[PDB]
Amino acid sequence: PLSVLIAEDNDICRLVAAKALEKCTNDITVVTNGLQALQAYQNRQFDVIIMDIQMPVMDGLEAVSEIRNYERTHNTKRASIIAITADTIDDDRPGAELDEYVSKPLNPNQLRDVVLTCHS
Amino acid sequence: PLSVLIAEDNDICRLVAAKALEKCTNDITVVTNGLQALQAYQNRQFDVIIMDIQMPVMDGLEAVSEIRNYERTHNTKRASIIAITADTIDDDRPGAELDEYVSKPLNPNQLRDVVLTCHS
Fold this sequence. Notes:
The PDB classes it as signaling protein, transferase. Keywords: structural genomics, signaling, PSI-2, Protein Structure Initiative, New York SGX Research Center for Structural Genomics, nysgxrc, Kinase, signaling protein, transferase. It forms a dimeric assembly. Crystal structure of the response regulator receiver domain of a signal transduction histidine kinase from Aspergillus oryzae. Two copies of one chain form a homodimer. By secondary structure, the first copy, chain A, is an alpha/beta fold. Chain A folds into two domains: 58 residues, Rossmann fold (3-Layer(aba) Sandwich), CATH 3.40.50.2300; 62 residues, no CATH class. Helices cover 40% and strands 21% of the residues of chain A. Chain A is elongated, with a radius of gyration of 19 Å. The N and C termini of chain A lie far apart (57 Å).
C-alpha cells in the first residue's frame, strides 16, 4: 500500500493532487507549509511525497502586501499590522507594510502593550 | 472589542502570541501560512494582525532538505519525492533533493503514473 504526503499551499493544486491519488490509496495526508511537511514526516512513514517546490505562494511580507492591496480596493479600514521578527530592528518607522515591530523571543507584556496601543 | 489574526508557522511563537492575547479578547484567529492570512482577512475583519515577517520557517525546497536530513540521521528508507512546479523543467535528472518532476497545471493521469512508478 502507498502512503502519500501532499505539501501544497495552492488550494486548487492541492485538491487536484488529492483527487488524482484518491483511487490509489486511502493513506493521503495533506499539509500547507514546509514545517508541516517535515512534522508529518517525523510522525508517519510516507513512501511518496508530492512537494510544490515553488511553495509558499506568498511569504509573510508578500501576505502583508496582499492584505494592504485588499484594503485599498475594498476601501476598508486599515488594520494595524505588527511585525514579529528575530532580526535586529534598525528602522522602526511605520510604513505602507508594517505599523510596529516586536522582536523575538516574544515578551508577552510587550506584545500586549503594542497590540492594545495599535487598537486604540 | 479586538479581533486579532496571528500568522506564524513557528509553533512556539504562535502559542506564546495566542496565550499573551487570550485575556484581551476571544476573537483570535491563528494561521500558519501567507495565503491563509490573506484568506482569513477576506473572510473576517481584523483590527490587528500579528505577522511573522520571517515566515516561512522553511519553504518547499528547504522542507525537502530537512526530510532528507531526517532520513539520513534516522537511517530510514528513502521516500520518493516528486516536485510539482509551474517552471519549465530543463534538467530532469533526479538528485539529492528530488526524484521526479511533474509540471503544473497538473495532469491527473500523469501524476498518478509518476507516483505509482516511484512507489514501485
